[PDB]
Amino acid sequence: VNSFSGYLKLTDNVYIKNADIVEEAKKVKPTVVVNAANVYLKHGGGVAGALNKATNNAMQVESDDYIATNGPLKVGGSCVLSGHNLAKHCLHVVGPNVNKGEDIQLLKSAYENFNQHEVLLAPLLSAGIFGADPIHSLRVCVDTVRTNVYLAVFDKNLYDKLVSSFL
Numbered sequence: 046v047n048s049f050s051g052y053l054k055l056t057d058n059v060y061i062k063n064a065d066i067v068e069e070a071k072k073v074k075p076t077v078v079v080n081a082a083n084v085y086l087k088h089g090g091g092v093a094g095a096l097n098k099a100t101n102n103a104m105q106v107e108s109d110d111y112i113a114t115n116g117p118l119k120v121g122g123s124c125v126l127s128g129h130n131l132a133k134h135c136l137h138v139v140g141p142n143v144n145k146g147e148d149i150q151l152l153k154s155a156y157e158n159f160n161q162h163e164v165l166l167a168p169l170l171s172a173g174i175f176g177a178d179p180i181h182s183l184r185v186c187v188d189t190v191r192t193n194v195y196l197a198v199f200d201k202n203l204y205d206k207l208v209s210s211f212l
């Protein structure tokens with residue numbers, strides 16, 4: 046039993062809700078919140094900008110130190126950093142950005158990072174300003190993630206389409 050509330054159950058291990066991931070994180074304080082990161086951990090917009098803003102820019106400060114030490118992530122890769130006031134940990138995952146020409150096959154690799162964590166709150170990878178088809182992102186999620194994932198979809202209109210079109 047966990048504290049996630051109001052989710053629709055899609056599969057054995059994948060759940061979904063129309064919710065602002067920022068507000069959802071503040072309420073549940075999950076062990077892991079997933080960020081829709083880029084390889085530079087520059088949290089300017091989209092989910093990343095919103096999560097970072099909610100940390101009062103502490104996420105960005107921590108991220109800049111991480112990059113200065115380690116260099117950029119790989120597309121499809123991830124790193125675990127602090128969850129600040131939102132969660133115990135933030136798993137920064139880099140899905141391919143279609144508006145950068147990056148291989149969509151990398152989306153499966155990106156979701157594989159979720160399997161290292163028993164329970165996660167997460168957005169759809171490569172969705173939103175990353176340019177991929179969110180319906181496809183959901184399919185890859187369900188077919189790749191085996192751990193318990195609670196997906197927050199900000200746009201109500203998109204949430205309804207994702208549910209109504211789910212096979």
Ligand SMILES: Cc1ccccc1[C@H](CC(=O)O)NC(=O)c1ncnc2[nH]ccc12
Nearest residue numbers: 066067091092095168172173174198199200
């Ligand atoms: C996954 C993604 C990647 C890039 C850009 C947007 C998104 C998603 C898309 C969706 O889930 O609809 N949007 C949001 O996460 C969002 N949108 C508006 N206000 C917000 N406040 C906290 C989060 C939040």
